[PDB]
Amino acid sequence: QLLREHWVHILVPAGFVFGCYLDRKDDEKLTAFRNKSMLFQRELRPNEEVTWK
Amino acid sequence: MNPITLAIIYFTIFLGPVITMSSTNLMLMWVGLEFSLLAIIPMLINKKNPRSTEAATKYFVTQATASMIILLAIVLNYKQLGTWMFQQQTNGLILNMTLMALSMKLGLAPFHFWLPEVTQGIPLHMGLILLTWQKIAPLSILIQIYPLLNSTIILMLAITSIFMGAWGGLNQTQMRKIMAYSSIAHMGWMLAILPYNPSLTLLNLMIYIILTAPMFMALMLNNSMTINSISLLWNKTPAMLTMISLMLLSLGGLPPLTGFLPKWIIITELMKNNCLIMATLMAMMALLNLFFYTRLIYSTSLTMFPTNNNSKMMTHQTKTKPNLMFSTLAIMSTMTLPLAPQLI
Amino acid sequence: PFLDIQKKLGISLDRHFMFLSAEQPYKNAARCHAFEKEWIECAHGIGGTRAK
Amino acid sequence: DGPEKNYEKTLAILQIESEKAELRLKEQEVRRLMRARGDGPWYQFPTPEKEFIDHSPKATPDN
Amino acid sequence: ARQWQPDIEWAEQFSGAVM
Amino acid sequence: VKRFFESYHEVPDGTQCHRKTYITTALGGICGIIGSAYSVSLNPADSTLEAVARVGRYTFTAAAIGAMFGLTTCVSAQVREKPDDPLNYFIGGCAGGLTLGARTHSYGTAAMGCVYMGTAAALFKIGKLEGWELFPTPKV
Amino acid sequence: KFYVREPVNAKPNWLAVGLSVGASVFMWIYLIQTHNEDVLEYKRRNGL
Amino acid sequence: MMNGRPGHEPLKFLPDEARSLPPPKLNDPRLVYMGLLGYCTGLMDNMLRMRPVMRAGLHRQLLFVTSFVFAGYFYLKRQNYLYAVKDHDMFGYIKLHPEDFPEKEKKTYAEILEPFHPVR
Amino acid sequence: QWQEDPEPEDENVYAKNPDFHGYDSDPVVDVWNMRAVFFFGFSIVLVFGTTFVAYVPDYRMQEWARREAERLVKYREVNGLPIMESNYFDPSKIQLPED
Amino acid sequence: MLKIILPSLMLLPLTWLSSPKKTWTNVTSYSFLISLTSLTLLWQTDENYKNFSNMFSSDPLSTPLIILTAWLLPLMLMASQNHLKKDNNVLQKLYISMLISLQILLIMTFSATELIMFYILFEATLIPTLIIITRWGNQTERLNAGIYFLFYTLIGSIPLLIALILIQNHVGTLNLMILSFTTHTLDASWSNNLLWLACMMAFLIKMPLYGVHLWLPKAHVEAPIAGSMILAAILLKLGSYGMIRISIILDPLTKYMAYPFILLSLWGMIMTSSICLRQTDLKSLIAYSSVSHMALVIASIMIQTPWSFMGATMLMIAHGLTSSLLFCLANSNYERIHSRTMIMARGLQMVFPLMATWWLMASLANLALPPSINLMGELFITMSLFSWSNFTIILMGINIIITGMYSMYMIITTQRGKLTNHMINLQPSHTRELTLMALHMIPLILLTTSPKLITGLTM
């Protein structure tokens, strides 16, 4: 626990994880047309509850 | 001064505009303007030297005539309609006389020749008050009657203020005059849009205040009144260069800083009403307004000037001057663009 | 106004002697009291551009 | 994930921005009409207060 | 060889009251 | 009278060269009188005769600017028949700038004023032609 | 080293520390409480 | 411009109409941005008075953060109420005056004919 | 004169620390900067990026397009159809104006 | 994209919190890692472009610029490591912060969907660049150079703000996905031609055009090094990207509003390559070569054809890499002689045999060597210009000749010949400044190996 000058290596990976989480939150925010586009518009399989999350 | 006198004078300065707002009677608005006039002079003239006497005389003589013209307008309106409020269906001559007198009160060009002189002839404080607290109530008068105003000379006064402020501040070594010409240009930006969505006038006013007050404090912290005096800042107070740079580059409207927001949304609300090419002219002369800010922050920050041998005592000794609101006002400026929809 | 403090508090410091038809000291009608009253009662609820 | 995800995300963004553009033009036309005629809540410029009129019996009949 | 910082003939051109 | 200066646009360019000419000359003389007033109030002369000489110089200068501008405009519209063409106004503005460089003995000012006045006058004709409104009324 | 001139900020102002800490605590408590009440009232007014 | 709106109570921060709006999350991006503003404000106040940065005024930094967030929450609630008032008045106005906003319907690209501009 | 320090004459490095790498004056920071730069610049970036990029499938739909084209010309030339007709939209669902 | 820019933001804490002796290594390694993470948006298995949110997007045009902007930060960072080594540590960290801010803003530009986000970031980039040029440049005309660079760009950009405001008030959104699907053709009025000019004379200031390029040599000569890197590699491309994005809402005016600028680009490209042919300052030689090369991209975008846009993207990335390489190569000699004149040191390749290979390969890239993404770009835009008019090749060949000439002459009179025996201070080399040229030149080889990435919208 002594002489933590290497603690600062956690910031940039934290930035990566946080940005991934934020993109995940955004495309959760945009879960319209999820299966209502004229190109795919598939019928859900008996086990799947969502098409692409 | 003594404490009772200071209490009296500062309370009168607070009540001048506060009377001018909470007053439907235009006569009481005039009363508030006269309070501000009467109470500012003891503090412009507190040092008792020829520069201060001249500044106070010029301020008094320039503001009294405008007060009398506003009173002429009010008396004519009362004669016309038997009411102490500018209705619609008044006379355009009355309204224009009022607007010209208020322009003389603020400092707008071509009624601008008194503001740089007066701001030069007084301390750093009472330039701050003169440029911030004394612009508000005169603006309140216009804000309350914005549909009655002529879109023509409102814009001519604006454009003239922009041009003259830029071309004045271009060649001033004294900072008390640079801030005055900045005031003139910003009041031009305000009064251009004042007949169009007057909330943006108050937006630009608050932005201008939040910029200028920290700047005047920066000049206070070493009694800086010259480019060659603010250039000796990397040796005295070298932690202020960052904020001074960002606030000057805000005053000259640049994008990521919140000083581009007023110009941007003002041009927006003018382009919505087909004031295209006047807005283009103003936007383009704002660059000439920015040039001397760039030169200034060159002089102080980027190409650090020669210092003196006696400036090392300043390094030994300590300071207590930053008032904990310098940081706040400088950080709400320079960094509050993404909150622009919460500002408008 | 700009800062409608009087409405926020209910007081009337100066908004009771704005126009002619407003409570002279002893009840002496100012001339054109009827006309100003009529104009003001027609231009109420409406604002400005339509009352003009 | 796949192409379906981005396809339908794009469709959502497109309807968002189209609705926003239409709302902006609607706001502009509405402000135009509201200022041209004070038929609405905005741009309702004030008038003299009606409550500070004295309706009492005066000193003269022909008030 | 060294970074150029200003000198007196540079700093004096901001001392004429009108520029 | 505003009608006298609005009569510049009742018939197109290439027609009534004299009317447009001394209309524009009167306009330039007006603006020169304004400039002389501002140049005599601020920065006065050592004597009223010097001041009046300054006023006459400014005024007849601006009158020459306007005269050559209007002449050149209606000429280059008369020649090369194209009234709806801002290049005529550009050429007239260049003549104005060259006169400014004649009365004020400088070729730099001549070319400067040529370019600037020409662009300004072309933009003026584009505004008159497309329906641009300086000093608009609030509509939103 | 040991200053010949004892500086004013040599010992803290425990009053200011306590006032600021209590202000922050009160601010956060009142903020979470008002947020809870406002969410509850939104769900009440607008139904569900 | 909406100061003449009916029911506009003067100098009222949050009318009871705003209590029907959904409030912020308290995790909102601009609120944590205001917290960042307050943190940087404390850091700048330390740098200006020749104090250690990130180490000196941990009550002052906390106070700045709390002030910024505790003001931004309510100011943002107000601004959301105001934008809601805007949209409400606008939708009500198009409902009142439908003739000025006609129910338009547009054609397809098969029926209309836009001109072709060859590059070449 | 105006009391400035003089022009510092040119220094040579490799007199001190002849294993100098260009990064720092400490012999250990030189090593641990060149090692990190070489590693994180070549060994992972220029290699794993190259592999990741080489193994992107159907970049902008190139293999798929050729495959679809193969089956489509197969269909069109088996059925004797006009290969790649002269109009993408049929006039059966277009309405021109008269005159 | 958020995952690319948030780490770039947290690199600033990594600068200011890391100890003075572990503040270059960590930030450089992590910047390489950002450059790595910025390769996922090459995953374009489908024709539909990538939209992560209303804020950010990514296309086959934006993505190469993104990756290059991420790549050039480590190179900036190590090239700026031998100078300002005797500077104060706070000053170092301030430099690193300026460069990281440039990176973040430029990625936000290239990823943007709206034009106003693009505008505010395109004009926010001026502040770090001005600071780098003026505070860390060595000469005294850096101030005038920063003034030129700032005010040229602002004078260009303000009409762009007005035109974008007009477009927003007309359409409603000012977003790029929609302005392509709803672009009514223009009446061909003087007002619409002024609109075209306003939209274009902010980028043409920056590409730049031959009428207005004087800001570019003044800044390249006096930007310390990394300013020259960025200002040659991506800040000129910020105008190319912008023109390609804005030219969709300006048809058919480009069929005749383009003639002056195609023409000026071609003739001034010959003029600037001639200036290159006879020049005392090497960092100005590179500058005028950059003008000559960007003029072809101006002409290509003005022609608005598929081959043309393709070759424009190719030449954009290729010129960026090779010009940054040439700037680093000249700085390698400036750090010993402290003079930009080329005839002073004119006999190397004795002491610097390996560095003289990077010189050679950079010059062969600067000129049109065929197996390389430079000649691909030049050749495809030349084919475009020929399809435009069969008489442009008369100009393009003259420039081809001059571009062989000044490059080979630069090589000769900077390396080949009698050594300056009076130069004891010609230190042999640094592994750092060899790795710079390696990291510049290996991507050129690899892009040449797989150039299906270095195309754009039309391929």
Side-chain angles (χ1 to χ4, degrees), chain C:
Chain C
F2 199 100
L3 309 173
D4 301 71
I5 297 162
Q6 303 184 4
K7 308 209 195 190
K8 181 69 191 168
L9 306 171
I11 59 174
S12 180
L13 298 181
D14 71 320
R15 56 183 194 126
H16 62 269
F17 51 87
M18 298 304 305
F19 45 85
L20 309 170
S21 47
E23 191 177 2
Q24 305 304 336
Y26 295 80
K27 285 181 280 192
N28 314 293
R31 55 179 270 270
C32 318
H33 165 91
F35 295 105
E36 188 142 32
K37 185 175 89 73
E38 212 68 48
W39 175 41
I40 288 157
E41 289 190 352
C42 182
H44 167 239
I46 303 157
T49 44
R50 174 168 189 241
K52 184 174 184 291

Side-chain angles (χ1 to χ4, degrees), chain J residues 10 18 48 67 283 295 405 412-413 416:
Chain J
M10 304 311 298
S18 315
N48 58 80
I67 297 144
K283 284 177 77 188
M405 281 296 101
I412 288 159
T413 195
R416 308 202 144 204

Side-chain angles (χ1 to χ4, degrees), chain J residues 84-142:
Chain J
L84 54 88
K85 65 181 167 184
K86 69 202 201 169
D87 279 10
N88 184 29
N89 200 41
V90 172
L91 210 65
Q92 296 184 6
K93 293 150 169 281
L94 179 69
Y95 202 74
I96 311 293
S97 297
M98 289 287 106
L99 304 177
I100 290 157
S101 310
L102 264 178
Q103 191 210 5
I104 298 151
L105 296 164
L106 286 148
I107 285 157
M108 286 158 151
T109 51
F110 295 124
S111 67
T113 58
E114 287 80 5
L115 278 297
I116 284 280
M117 207 163 181
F118 179 81
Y119 174 89
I120 63 182
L121 303 157
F122 161 88
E123 274 279 336
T125 61
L126 310 177
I127 283 149
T129 54
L130 184 91
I131 289 162
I132 292 156
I133 291 158
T134 54
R135 177 69 196 74
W136 280 283
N138 288 299
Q139 287 284 284
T140 188
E141 291 88 39
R142 52 179 178 188

Side-chain angles (χ1 to χ4, degrees), chain B residues 130-144:
Chain B
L130 182 73
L131 265 61
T132 62
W133 190 247
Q134 302 287 109
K135 299 286 183 264
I136 286 163
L139 278 168
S140 178
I141 311 317
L142 278 298
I143 291 276
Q144 187 171 359

Side-chain angles (χ1 to χ4, degrees), chain F residues 12-79:
Chain F
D13 302 309
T15 70
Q16 293 188 333
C17 292
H18 69 123
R19 189 78 264 161
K20 299 186 179 295
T21 308
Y22 66 100
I23 282 162
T24 313
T25 311
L27 191 137
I30 288 292
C31 311
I33 291 161
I34 307 324
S36 310
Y38 280 109
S39 195
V40 170
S41 314
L42 312 155
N43 191 48
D46 268 16
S47 50
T48 313
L49 183 62
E50 270 66 11
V52 169
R54 191 186 305 190
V55 174
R57 277 197 283 104
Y58 282 50
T59 312
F60 276 90
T61 310
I65 306 313
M68 295 311 121
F69 179 81
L71 260 172
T72 315
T73 53
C74 188
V75 160
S76 284
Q78 184 166 310
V79 175

Side-chain angles (χ1 to χ4, degrees), chain G residues 8-32:
Chain G
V8 300
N9 317 122
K11 198 166 178 196
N13 202 351
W14 302 89
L15 175 57
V17 172
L19 287 177
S20 294
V21 168
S24 289
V25 169
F26 156 78
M27 279 161 146
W28 275 115
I29 288 154
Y30 187 52
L31 180 61
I32 63 177

Side-chain angles (χ1 to χ4, degrees), chain D residues 1-7 9-22 24-25 28, chain J residues 44-54 113-114 168-175 177-178 181:
Chain D
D1 273 29
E4 299 171 347
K5 165 161 165 196
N6 178 30
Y7 202 84
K9 219 194 293 188
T10 317
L11 297 170
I13 287 148
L14 284 173
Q15 73 154 8
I16 285 157
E17 291 290 351
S18 313
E19 288 169 330
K20 281 157 68 165
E22 188 60 26
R24 288 208 202 75
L25 300 172
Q28 289 294 116
Chain J
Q44 190 71 87
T45 68
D46 55 356
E47 80 302 346
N48 58 80
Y49 303 155
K50 299 174 83 72
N51 280 281
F52 312 95
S53 59
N54 282 266
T113 58
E114 287 80 5
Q168 188 252 329
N169 287 291
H170 196 283
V171 189
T173 175
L174 203 61
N175 192 41
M177 272 182 277
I178 283 150
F181 304 144

Side-chain angles (χ1 to χ4, degrees), chain J residues 369-431:
Chain J
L369 199 79
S372 169
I373 51 163
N374 290 272
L375 183 141
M376 291 193 80
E378 277 135 11
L379 191 84
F380 282 121
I381 67 186
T382 299
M383 294 143 57
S384 305
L385 290 150
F386 203 80
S387 84
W388 200 72
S389 177
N390 310 292
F391 293 84
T392 58
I393 197 155
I394 296 170
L395 299 162
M396 304 297 275
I398 293 164
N399 185 42
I400 285 154
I401 298 155
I402 301 153
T403 311
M405 281 296 101
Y406 74 73
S407 296
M408 291 278 105
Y409 164 69
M410 166 174 159
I411 288 159
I412 288 159
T413 195
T414 307
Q415 273 61 41
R416 308 202 144 204
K418 297 213 199 189
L419 184 60
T420 71
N421 51 20
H422 68 86
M423 284 191 175
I424 307 161
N425 62 349
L426 276 179
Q427 311 184 13
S429 282
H430 308 161
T431 311

